[PDB]
Write a sequence for this structure.
């Protein structure tokens, strides 16, 4: 399916992990921040309609 | 905040702003000047 | 018959080296934790 | 620091491209179901086409014909078919009418060339064989029609057309201009050009671990 | 501009209606014959 994925390229330039940015709200949060770790907070990840 | 603003300013060079490519050297390799200027004016307007 | 994809089936989206970085691409991917149909060669 | 010299690095291949086998084919396809050769792994002179008096038009989009010998593409797709001389107007990106929709819709963002010429010498006889009716769709009660070509026909005369569509992807290039490669230079500010990727910089050899496809 | 003889009268950077309002330092008039098909090519930025 056509999806946004956030891809973790390591030091050697192999992809070692990914976030499917449409999977769940934590995955939207990771992709909103371009980050696999998320610090404690409230994050405006999207607008629904 | 400084690092985020620089990274954002640098990353905005990748944007088309409506040009056929966001790379200045593509337009100058592909297109002759009368048609190239129409694409470069869009890049100048977005980058400015 | 079905099984879960888990996080299987990501692939390098383009012919480019990148390193120590997070890159957000959008492309045709296998969705995470989706079902995959399961079949047998025999039996 | 201004660049000291230019460096040009095209692929180490020299076989000339098969454009003659497109341009001199015995029959160009019926436009409802046009034909499409792929050019790859060869050197493409475009000045031998653009300099030819044989062509009534040579019009390009996303590239200028004067520049084509500097470019270096991954594939080139050559469409071939026949139409009436009025319908060459409809073979352009963003057009409207019978050819622009019902048989040969171009992409709205086409990068390529449309090369068309009168063929009333060879496609007229009349001759009734050439059959007419989404982007690069082949449009195979239903509509079917064919052109009537007699040498007495100018808008109703046969025109032959080639449409070149250019693949500017980031893969290993295979259809590249006559522009010959130089030596490589390192630790010096140079006006480099790899496969048409022009820039300016200090090239220096790197410890980075490129994967074999990158 | 009022003559029926001119098959084309294409002006750039000025409109043929306006020209009686203007003064110029010079006019140059460049005079030659071409085949009717190439009358397209006699323009800023055209090719062939
Ligand atoms: C990176 O490459 C080096 C050299 O091949 C190797 O020793 C190291 O284990 C690699 N690390 C990872 C995380 O792939
Ligand atoms: C088509 O045939 C002519 C005569 O044999 C030849 O000169 C020409 O090179 C061919 N066309 C192309 C595009 O090579």
């Amino acid at each position: 399916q056509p999806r946004t994925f956030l891809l973790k390229y390591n030091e050697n330039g192999t992809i070692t992990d990914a976030v499917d940015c449409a999977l769940d709200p934590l995955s939207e949060t990771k992709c909103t921040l371009k980050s696999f770790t998320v610090e404690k907070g409230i994050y405006q990840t999207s607008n629904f309609r | 905040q400084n690092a985020q603003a620089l990274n954002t300013l640098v990353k905005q060079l990748s944007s088309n702003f409506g040009a056929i490519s966001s790379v200045l050297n593509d337009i100058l390799s592909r297109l002759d000047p009368p048609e190239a200027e129409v694409q470069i004016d869009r890049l100048i307007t977005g980058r400015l | 018959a079905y099984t879960n994809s888990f996080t299987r089936g990501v692939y390098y989206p383009d012919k480019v080296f990148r390193s120590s970085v997070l890159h957000s691409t959008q492309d045709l991917f296998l969705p995470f934790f989706s079902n995959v149909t399961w079949f047998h060669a025999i039996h | 620091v201004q660049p000291t010299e230019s460096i040009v690095r095209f692929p180490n291949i020299t076989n000339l491209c098969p454009f003659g086998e497109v341009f001199n084919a015995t029959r160009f396809a019926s436009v409802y179901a046009w034909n499409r050769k792929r050019i790859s792994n060869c050197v493409a002179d475009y000045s031998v086409l653009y300099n030819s008096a044989s062509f009534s038009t040579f019009k390009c989009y996303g590239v200028s014909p004067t520049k084509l010998n500097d470019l270096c593409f991954t594939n080139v797709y050559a469409d071939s078919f026949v139409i009436r001389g009025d319908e060459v107007r409809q073979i352009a990106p963003g057009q409207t009418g019978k050819i622009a929709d019902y048989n040969y819709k171009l992409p709205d963002d086409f990068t390529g060339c449309v090369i068309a010429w009168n063929s009333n010498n060879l496609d007229s006889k009349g001759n009734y064989n050439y059959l007419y009716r989404k982007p690069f769709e082949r449009d195979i009660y239903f509509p079917l029609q064919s052109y009537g070509f007699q040498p007495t026909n100018v808008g109703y005369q046969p025109y032959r057309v080639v449409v070149l569509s250019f693949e500017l992807l980031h893969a290993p290039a295979t259809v590249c201009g006559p522009k010959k490669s130089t030596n490589l230079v390192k630790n010096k500010c140079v006006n480099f050009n790899f496969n048409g990727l022009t820039g300016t910089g200090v090239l220096t050899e790197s410890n980075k671990k490129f994967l074999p496809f990158q």
